[PDB]
Structures are given as structure tokens and as C-alpha cells.
Amino acid sequence: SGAIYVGNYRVVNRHLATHNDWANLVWEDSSRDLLVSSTTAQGCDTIARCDCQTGVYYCSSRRKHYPVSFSKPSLIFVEASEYYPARYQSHLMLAVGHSEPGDCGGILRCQHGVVGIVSTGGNGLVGFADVRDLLWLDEE
Numbered sequence: 001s002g003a004i005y006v007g008n009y010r011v012v013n014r015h016l017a018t019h020n021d022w023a024n025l026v027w028e029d030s031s032r033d034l035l036v037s038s039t040t041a042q043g044c045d046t047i048a049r050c051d052c053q054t055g056v057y058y059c060s061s062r063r064k065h066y067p068v069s070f071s072k073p074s075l076i077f078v079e080a081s082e083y084y085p086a087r088y089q090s091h092l093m094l095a096v097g098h099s100e101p102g103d104c105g106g107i108l109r110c111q112h113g114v115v116g117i118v119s120t121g122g123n124g125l126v127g128f129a130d131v132r133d134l135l136w137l138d139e140e
């Protein structure tokens, strides 16, 4: 589990969105596994607006932040899970690292801010949904 809190937005994995998220919906995209809801309180996270390909992510199943090198956002084939059939997920970046069921939502960050959140795992790989192109997260 996990979310990004920027401005008056909460960014979560679409597959983990709550009823309150859906009832206060700003934007959702199943192809990216992302959903953004509105919040009453202002958040403290800042979104990275950069071209970093190295950063650090939080892995809840290890209680640890790991440094990783990750691929550029791309259209990657993801196997069927209990949340989606086997399909192409867009704006996904892969790295070598631990990601098991429950790690979705952990933040990937660089020196500039938040880059994305854990969205896929298994096989010693971890995939992150990028958020750096969602410029509107920085404004009202």
C-alpha cells in the first residue's frame, strides 16, 4: 500500500483505490494503473520534473529503501494477476529489485522529488508507474 500526497491530490495504484478515492475522483487510467483523488489537507511530497534513470524506492516487504537503476517509461507486457488480465501497461519503468504482493504504492524518488510508485513485481523485478509527465499535479 502507499500513496503520493502532493498539493490537494492523493495518487494511488488504481487497483488499490478505496471507495473514498472513487467518490472524490480527479483522474484515473487503467492502462497506467493510476488513480488520483482530492484531499482536504495539503500534502508534502514534491513531484520530480527530470530525466533521472537512478533513484531509490521503498519496499514494504523488507522495511527498506533500495537504490535502483530503472528503464525509461515504456509500454511493458504485464502477466495476469487478480487485478488485471495479461496486458500492456503504459508509462511503466522496470528495475531489478524485490516487489511482492503488498509492495504496490511504495515511492520511487530521486534528488528532484517523487518519480512514481511501485505497480508491478515478481521474478526479482519491480515496476514503477511514472508520474513525472502529469504536470497538472503541481497546480490547483
Ligand SMILES: NC(=O)[C@H]1CCCN(C(=O)C2CCSCC2)C1
Pocket: 015, 033, 078, 081, 082, 083, 084, 089, 099, 100, 101, 119, 120, 121, 122
Ligand atoms: N500493475 C499491475 O498490473 C500489477 C497488479 C498487481 C499484480 N502485479 C504484479 O506484478 C504482482 C507482483 C508480485 S507477484 C504477483 C504479481 C501486476
Ligand SMILES: [Zn+2]
Pocket: 048, 049, 050, 051, 052, 110, 111, 112, 113
Ligand atoms: Zn530527478
